[PDB]
Design an enzyme around this catalytic site. Structure first.
Site, PDB file in Angstrom:
ATOM      1  N   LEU A 297       0.843  -1.271   0.104  1.00  0.00           N
ATOM      2  CA  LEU A 297      -0.125   0.064   0.097  1.00  0.00           C
ATOM      3  C   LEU A 297       0.803   1.268   0.031  1.00  0.00           C
ATOM      4  CD1 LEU A 297      -2.642  -1.204   2.646  1.00  0.00           C
ATOM      5  CD2 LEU A 297      -2.940  -1.042   0.135  1.00  0.00           C
ATOM      6  N   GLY A 298       2.236   1.282   0.584  1.00  0.00           N
ATOM      7  CA  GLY A 298       2.994   2.202   0.797  1.00  0.00           C
ATOM      8  C   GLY A 298       4.535   2.120   1.085  1.00  0.00           C
ATOM      9  N   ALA A 299       5.148   2.627   0.580  1.00  0.00           N
ATOM     10  CA  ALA A 299       6.682   2.365   1.131  1.00  0.00           C
ATOM     11  C   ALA A 299       7.378   3.820   1.565  1.00  0.00           C
ATOM     12  CB  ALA A 299       7.247   1.724  -0.106  1.00  0.00           C
ATOM     13  N   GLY A 300       8.563   3.396   2.151  1.00  0.00           N
ATOM     14  CA  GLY A 300       8.951   4.703   2.868  1.00  0.00           C
ATOM     15  C   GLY A 300      10.445   4.432   3.318  1.00  0.00           C
ATOM     16  N   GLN A 301      10.873   5.283   4.442  1.00  0.00           N
ATOM     17  CA  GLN A 301      12.282   5.351   4.916  1.00  0.00           C
ATOM     18  C   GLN A 301      12.541   4.107   5.849  1.00  0.00           C
ATOM     19  OE1 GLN A 301      12.943   9.354   5.166  1.00  0.00           O
ATOM     20  NE2 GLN A 301      15.046   9.102   6.292  1.00  0.00           N
TER      21      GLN A 301
ATOM     22  N   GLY B  25      10.473   1.242   6.057  1.00  0.00           N
ATOM     23  CA  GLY B  25       9.516   0.000   5.499  1.00  0.00           C
ATOM     24  C   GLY B  25       8.320   0.319   4.739  1.00  0.00           C
ATOM     25  N   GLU B  26       7.529  -0.731   4.805  1.00  0.00           N
ATOM     26  CA  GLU B  26       6.363  -0.597   3.975  1.00  0.00           C
ATOM     27  C   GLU B  26       5.126  -0.985   4.633  1.00  0.00           C
ATOM     28  OE1 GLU B  26       8.280  -4.086   2.044  1.00  0.00           O
ATOM     29  OE2 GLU B  26       8.690  -2.784   0.012  1.00  0.00           O
ATOM     30  N   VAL B  27       4.122  -0.775   4.193  1.00  0.00           N
ATOM     31  CA  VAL B  27       2.750  -1.013   4.740  1.00  0.00           C
ATOM     32  C   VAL B  27       1.899  -2.036   3.598  1.00  0.00           C
ATOM     33  CG1 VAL B  27       0.354  -0.426   5.553  1.00  0.00           C
ATOM     34  CG2 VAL B  27       2.394   1.038   6.003  1.00  0.00           C
TER      35      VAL B  27
ATOM     36  N   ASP C  77       3.892  13.978  14.697  1.00  0.00           N
ATOM     37  CA  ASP C  77       3.820  14.185  13.230  1.00  0.00           C
ATOM     38  C   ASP C  77       2.298  14.047  12.832  1.00  0.00           C
ATOM     39  OD1 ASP C  77       5.134  14.133  10.843  1.00  0.00           O
ATOM     40  OD2 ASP C  77       4.517  11.897  10.410  1.00  0.00           O
TER      41      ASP C  77
HETATM   42  N1  LIG Z   1      -3.628   0.517   8.918  1.00  0.00           N
HETATM   43  C1  LIG Z   1      -3.832   0.862   7.581  1.00  0.00           C
HETATM   44  N2  LIG Z   1      -4.851   0.247   6.808  1.00  0.00           N
HETATM   45  C2  LIG Z   1      -5.359   0.625   5.627  1.00  0.00           C
HETATM   46  N3  LIG Z   1      -4.253   1.331   4.825  1.00  0.00           N
HETATM   47  C3  LIG Z   1      -3.308   1.732   5.416  1.00  0.00           C
HETATM   48  C4  LIG Z   1      -2.873   1.223   7.004  1.00  0.00           C
HETATM   49  C5  LIG Z   1      -1.855   1.854   7.183  1.00  0.00           C
HETATM   50  C6  LIG Z   1      -0.981   1.976   8.545  1.00  0.00           C
HETATM   51  C7  LIG Z   1      -0.351   3.289   8.866  1.00  0.00           C
HETATM   52  C8  LIG Z   1       0.295   3.393  10.121  1.00  0.00           C
HETATM   53  C9  LIG Z   1       0.497   2.341  10.699  1.00  0.00           C
HETATM   54  N4  LIG Z   1       1.252   2.550  12.043  1.00  0.00           N
HETATM   55  C10 LIG Z   1       1.615   1.740  13.129  1.00  0.00           C
HETATM   56  O1  LIG Z   1       1.314   0.500  12.918  1.00  0.00           O
HETATM   57  N5  LIG Z   1       2.412   2.302  13.938  1.00  0.00           N
HETATM   58  C11 LIG Z   1       2.887   1.817  15.009  1.00  0.00           C
HETATM   59  C12 LIG Z   1       2.098   1.063  15.991  1.00  0.00           C
HETATM   60  C13 LIG Z   1       2.989   0.458  17.058  1.00  0.00           C
HETATM   61  C14 LIG Z   1       4.069   0.669  17.309  1.00  0.00           C
HETATM   62  C15 LIG Z   1       4.929   1.254  16.254  1.00  0.00           C
HETATM   63  C16 LIG Z   1       4.197   1.878  15.189  1.00  0.00           C
HETATM   64  C17 LIG Z   1       0.157   0.966  10.353  1.00  0.00           C
HETATM   65  C18 LIG Z   1      -0.633   0.939   9.149  1.00  0.00           C
HETATM   66  C19 LIG Z   1      -1.121   2.698   6.026  1.00  0.00           C
HETATM   67  N6  LIG Z   1      -2.176   2.693   5.000  1.00  0.00           N
HETATM   68  C20 LIG Z   1      -1.995   3.068   3.564  1.00  0.00           C
HETATM   69  C21 LIG Z   1      -0.458   2.756   3.448  1.00  0.00           C
HETATM   70  C22 LIG Z   1       0.002   4.248   3.034  1.00  0.00           C
HETATM   71  C23 LIG Z   1      -0.926   5.315   2.875  1.00  0.00           C
HETATM   72  C24 LIG Z   1      -2.128   4.533   3.654  1.00  0.00           C
END
Ligand SMILES: Nc1ncnc2c1c(-c1ccc(NC(=O)Nc3ccccc3)cc1)cn2C1CCCC1
Ligand SMILES: [Ca+2]
Ligand SMILES: [Cl-]
Length: 425
Positions: A180-184, A186-188, A293
């Site tokens: 769904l997304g990549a970055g610095q 890691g990825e989602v 952030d």
């Molecule tokens: N949960 C989601 N469901 C559907 N789409 C999602 C997402 C996410 C998503 C965004 C931030 C996180 N962050 C996260 O889990 N952070 C975190 C939690 C506990 C400890 C350390 C970090 C996880 C998934 C990101 N995305 C997409 C990917 C890029 C744009 C939106």
């Protein structure tokens, strides 16, 4: 011998959990959190049930018109969601009269629009035996109400709680099906857990983010659950670290605002989004934490247009246009610097995801800020909403409002205080 009854149908998806239909009763054997060991009276099978799917028999939650633990604004949100109509209603715990119950009814008003009126409960010119009879009367002609009761408010199944004792999971349980997304760092990924549950998975790149220290913080975030923060479901302990959260169908607020469903969202909806986010920040504010952030890219939109703060804990393990000068110059990030960010976030929302300070580089922006510059007001943003942004953008942090205040203002933006609850003869 405790007995409960099923509020919604449920299909078993694990090994030891029971299937059951709406109306089935069962004997509670063990109370161990989100999951309860029970014995269905319809099947005689013993196993685990999601505890939020059942209520004690003959208790108020069994009624289709009762809604436990629902705030006045949540009741307003639920009643205005699609599937409802004129006269749709609910009875809920009073948010103010902590011990009594209130009525919430859907109305249409030619000037305002679709609205929700709230009536407190125990008119003295009506004595019904208990809450059921009360409902029964107002369905056939209003006895004073702005609209007469039609059907109870639409309710959907609660989210399935995560598998019991499945906080630490093996990687094998996951199929990461779509990046769904990549970055610095890691990825989602959109992923599937044990072939039954759709989840989101943050895959980490290893750095100074020490393993047993990264997991320490994730364990902290797991204690800080709130309806407006993204659910932390599970964790994979072995490098590279996987973070499993709930899946948010409409992705980021930033992307959703830029979409075509987004560009249809009226201003009252955009403000509602802001109110949800501020509620999340207010929780964080109360718990004495910091997001660091805050911006539209770090807010997630669910399929039902619910906005949640995408965690937040990433600052406990690791874009100046969203940053207050105090945190830029001296690195003094506080809950007040988030307020500034929230103000910038607010502008993003009203501008449907348009980038802040459009046309200005970072240093352009900074020196402009020290001059005293602030972004102007869009030709669709209300004066009173713009004034809120400005208050967030106060140069001295201590003069910016609390999120608690911001939430309360955005929540009742179109409602005079005197008009929260209706008052009857
Ligand atoms: N949960 C989601 N469901 C559907 N789409 C999602 C997402 C996410 C998503 C965004 C931030 C996180 N962050 C996260 O889990 N952070 C975190 C939690 C506990 C400890 C350390 C970090 C996880 C998934 C990101 N995305 C997409 C990917 C890029 C744009 C939106
Ligand atoms: Ca009144
Ligand atoms: Cl039995």
């Amino acid at each position: 011998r405790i007995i409960v009854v099923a509020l919604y149908d449920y299909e078993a998806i694990h090994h030891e959990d029971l299937s059951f239909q709406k109306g089935d009763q069962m004997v509670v054997l063990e109370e161990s959190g989100e999951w309860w060991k029970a014995r269905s009276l319809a099947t005689r099978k013993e196993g685990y049930i999601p505890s939020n799917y059942v209520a004690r028999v003959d208790s108020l939650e069994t009624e289709e018109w009762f809604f436990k633990g629902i705030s006045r604004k949540d009741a307003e949100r639920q009643l205005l969601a699609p599937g409802n109509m004129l006269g749709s209603f609910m009875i809920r715990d009073s948010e103010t009269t902590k011990g009594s119950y209130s009525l919430s009814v859907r109305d249409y008003d030619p000037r305002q629009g679709d609205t929700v009126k709230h009536y407190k409960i125990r008119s003295p010119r009506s004595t019904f035996s208990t809450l059921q009879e009360l409902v029964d009367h107002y369905k056939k002609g209003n006895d004073g109400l702005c609209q007469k009761l039609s059907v109870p408010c639409m309710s959907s199944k609660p989210q399935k709680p995560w598998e019991k004792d499945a906080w630490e999971i093996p990687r094998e349980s996951l199929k990461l099906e779509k990046k769904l997304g990549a970055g610095q760092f890691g990825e989602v990924w959109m992923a599937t857990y044990n072939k039954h549950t759709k989840v989101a998975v943050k895959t980490m790149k290893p750095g100074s983010m020490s393993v047993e220290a990264f997991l320490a913080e994730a364990n902290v975030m797991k204690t800080l659950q709130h309806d407006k923060l993204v659910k932390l479901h599970a964790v994979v302990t072995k490098e590279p670290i996987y973070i499993i959260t709930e899946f948010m169908a409409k992705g980021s607020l930033l992307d959703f605002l830029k979409s075509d469903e987004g560009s249809k969202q009226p201003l009252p909806k955009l403000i509602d989004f802001s109110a949800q986010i501020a509620e999340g920040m207010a929780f964080i504010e109360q718990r004495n934490y910091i997001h660091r952030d805050l911006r539209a890219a770090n807010i997630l939109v669910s399929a039902s247009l619910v906005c949640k703060i995408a965690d937040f804990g990433l600052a406990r393990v690791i874009p100046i246009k969203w940053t207050a000068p105090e945190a830029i110059n001296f690195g003094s990030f506080t809950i007040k610097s988030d307020v500034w960010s929230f103000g910038i976030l607010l502008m993003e929302i009203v501008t449907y995801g348009r980038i802040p300070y459009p046309g200005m580089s970072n240093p352009e922006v900074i020196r402009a800020l020290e001059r005293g510059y602030r972004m102007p007001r869009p030709e669709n943003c209300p004066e009173e909403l713009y004034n809120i942004m400005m208050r967030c953008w106060k140069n001295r942090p201590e003069e910016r409002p609390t999120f608690e205040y911001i939430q309360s203002v955005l929540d009742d933006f179109y409602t005079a205080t005197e008009s929260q609850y209706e008052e009857i003869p």
